[PDB]
Amino acid sequence: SMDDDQVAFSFILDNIVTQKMMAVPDSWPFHHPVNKKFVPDYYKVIVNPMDLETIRKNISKHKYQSRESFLDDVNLILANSVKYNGPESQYTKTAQEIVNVCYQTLTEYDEHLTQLEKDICTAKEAALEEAELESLD
Numbered sequence: 001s002m003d004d005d006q007v008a009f010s011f012i013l014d015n016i017v018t019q020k021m022m023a024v025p026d027s028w029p030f031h032h033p034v035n036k037k038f039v040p041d042y043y044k045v046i047v048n049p050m051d052l053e054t055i056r057k058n059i060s061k062h063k064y065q066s067r068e069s070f071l072d073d074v075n076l077i078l079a080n081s082v083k084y085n086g087p088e089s090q091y092t093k094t095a096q097e098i099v100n101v102c103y104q105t106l107t108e109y110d111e112h113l114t115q116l117e118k119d120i121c122t123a124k125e126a127a128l129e130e131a132e133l134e135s136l137d
């Protein structure tokens, strides 16, 4: 079912986050949203904040239906470090390793993720078609 497939897809992504990305050494700056009381300037600069806790919350809500949408938020972590800390900051080097281990692990699971992504997309289109046919009955 689309529910079993979304659960599987989300579990794979969550395991990539907790077992690989969160395990990158010294990755603590990216585990949670920046606290405005600690870094008030952060939210004057960073318009689209992102972090690994927020990604996990999004996974639990089944936000990500595709590898692309998942990686959109993953890359935001890196892009935001480039902007706030600079492209050569040690913070950005760490964010880069987080992104790289994400890519590496996605590649290991690309066969299964690609199939889940396709099957979720077909089931979603079918449910949309049926809902529209029912509303017009």
Ligand SMILES: C[C@@H]1COCCN1c1cc(C2([S@](C)(N)O)CC2)nc(-c2ccnc3[nH]ccc23)n1
Binding pocket: 028, 029, 030, 031, 032, 033, 034, 035, 036, 038, 039, 042, 081, 084, 085, 091
């Ligand atoms: C602003 C820096 C550099 O870019 C990425 C995130 N970064 C963070 C992130 C955090 C959080 S947190 C405690 N939830 O705000 C998410 C874990 N914290 C501090 C921080 C907080 C207080 N003093 C500090 N001194 C130096 C850094 C620092 N930096």
